[PDB]
């Protein structure tokens, strides 16, 4: 009838959802531990959240199989794209805003004060578009893994990273199939999720274009972000 999820697939899903909740919290109480101040809140919150993405990625099955420089290539390229997903995941429809518990840095006003107000509407549009997909934590977690293992320029072993990604892709396909009783609409749900990969390429580019704009205006990023976003 409907191909069931193998024990490796069910274990992978439970593993990713478990550590997604653990790396969800931009905490360790580092909010307390860690017009210039508005831009410094954004850069400090981003550093903390990027470090959660790196630890989430380093714990993904397959991340240890690839070369070290291939790991740096993936983490440098997926960092901004996964940041769009994490912020979009906290969209609240009732207020049409992003609620990040510590709702200060990623609010409209802090972005307006820091001079990056022109970016808010492009972000919220993506938030609305992603919110309407109604992804559960399995859809969202598997998508995050698929973003990390995407084919990036400069990979020494692109075929290897593709084989790793295919394992998460196939897990996502079978999960949707079992959740929809092999309905033809499984392709629609699956295809729309893969469509997000296309759209976050634009957002990551727009993020790269702001990093370029900051250098021309001589406003500098914290060195952790400068190295990961390839100044």
């Amino acid at each position: 009838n409907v191909p069931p999820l193998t024990a490796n697939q069910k274990s992978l899903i439970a593993r990713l959802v478990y550590y997604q909740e653990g790396y969800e919290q931009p905490s360790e109480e580092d909010l307390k531990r860690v017009s210039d101040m508005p831009f410094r809140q954004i850069t400090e919150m981003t550093i903390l959240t990027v470090q959660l993405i790196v630890e989430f990625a380093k714990g993904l099955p397959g991340f240890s199989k690839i070369s070290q420089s291939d790991q740096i290539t993936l983490l440098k390229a997926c960092s901004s794209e996964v940041m769009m997903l994490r912020v979009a995941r906290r969209y609240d429809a009732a207020t049409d805003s992003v609620l990040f518990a510590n709702n200060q840095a990623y609010t409209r006003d802090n972005y307006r004060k820091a001079g990056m107000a022109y970016v808010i509407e492009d972000l919220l549009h993506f938030c609305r578009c992603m919110y309407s997909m109604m992804m559960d934590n399995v859809h969202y977690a598997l998508l995050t893994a698929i973003v990390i293992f995407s084919d990036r320029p400069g990979l020494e072993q692109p075929s290897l990273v593709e084989e790793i990604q295919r394992y998460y892709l196939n897990t996502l396909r079978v999960y949707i199939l079992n959740q929809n009783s092999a309905s033809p609409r499984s392709a629609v749900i699956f295809g729309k999720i893969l469509g997000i990969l296309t759209e976050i390429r634009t957002l990551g580019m727009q993020n790269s274009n702001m990093c370029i704009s900051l250098k021309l205006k001589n406003r500098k990023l914290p060195p952790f972000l400068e190295e990961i976003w390839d100044v």
Binding site: D151, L169, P184, G191, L194, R201, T202
Partner: protein, 248 residues
């Protein structure tokens, strides 16, 4: 959306656009950083792209249920995807000229001409030249992508419900979702042996997006795009351009 099918998109591909009423989407501006010794060749390439955009507008117009969309939505969809479709067609055409330890050297901008990698190096666009031929052309040949999957992906590229400014997003969703059904069914009935093919095909789309964004940087850097007038060109092209002719 019942008329929208891979079979109809296949017979649309044979239709040839009539003598294209020239719309100057791409042109060499009055003050352009393109060196004078290369403005004429670059201008000819712009005139070639403009004809292909015009054939693209006429293609999108006769797509089933596209013309029933709101006219403002039709303009936005073509405005946001014309570049990716040009590159996707370039990559599709360039597969013949693949090997006709070295990278691919020829890119087919149109049936009767090719771009050599050395000309891309002199223009400083070598990296994007190689990305088109490897991430798209070579990958589609390795993937054994047939014409049915090509026309389906073109429709999926065009029918993007995430385009900012649409007035009827759900009318575009219904069209793209029908294409997902068509592509998945075609993979199950004809490519039954290959697993993960549906995902493998759609993975070219984010690669196509990044390459398209890099091309826009070069085009805008050399002041080649008339961005303030493209929506207007698309408006008049949908209304006045002659319909295609079936060669049959």
């Amino acid at each position: 959306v019942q008329e929208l099918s891979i079979e109809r998109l296949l017979e649309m591909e044979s239709l040839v656009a009539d003598p294209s009423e020239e719309f100057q989407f791409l042109r060499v501006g009055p003050d352009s950083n393109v060196p004078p010794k290369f403005r004429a060749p670059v201008s000819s390439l712009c005139q070639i792209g403009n004809k292909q955009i015009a054939a693209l507008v006429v293609w999108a117009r006769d797509i089933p249920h596209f013309s029933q969309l709101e006219m403002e939505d039709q303009i936005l969809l073509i405005k946001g995807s014309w570049n990716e479709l040009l590159l996707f067609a370039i990559a599709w055409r360039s597969m013949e000229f693949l090997t006709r330890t070295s990278p691919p050297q020829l890119m087919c901008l149109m049936p009767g001409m090719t771009l050599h990698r050395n000309s891309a190096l002199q223009a400083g666009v070598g990296q994007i030249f190689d990305r088109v031929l490897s991430e798209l052309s070579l990958k589609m040949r390795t993937l054994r992508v047939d014409q049915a999957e090509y026309v389906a992906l073109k429709a999926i590229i065009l029918l993007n419900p995430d385009v900012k400014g649409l007035k009827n997003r759900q009318e575009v969703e219904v069209l793209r979702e029908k294409m997902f059904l068509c592509l998945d069914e075609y993979c199950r009935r004809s490519r039954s042996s290959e697993e993960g093919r549906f995902a493998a095909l759609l993975l070219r789309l984010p690669a196509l997006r990044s390459i398209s964004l890099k091309s826009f940087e070069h085009l805008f850097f050399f002041h080649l795009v008339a961005d303030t007038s493209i929506a207007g060109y698309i408006r008049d092209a949908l209304r006045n351009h002659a319909p295609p002719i079936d060669t049959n």
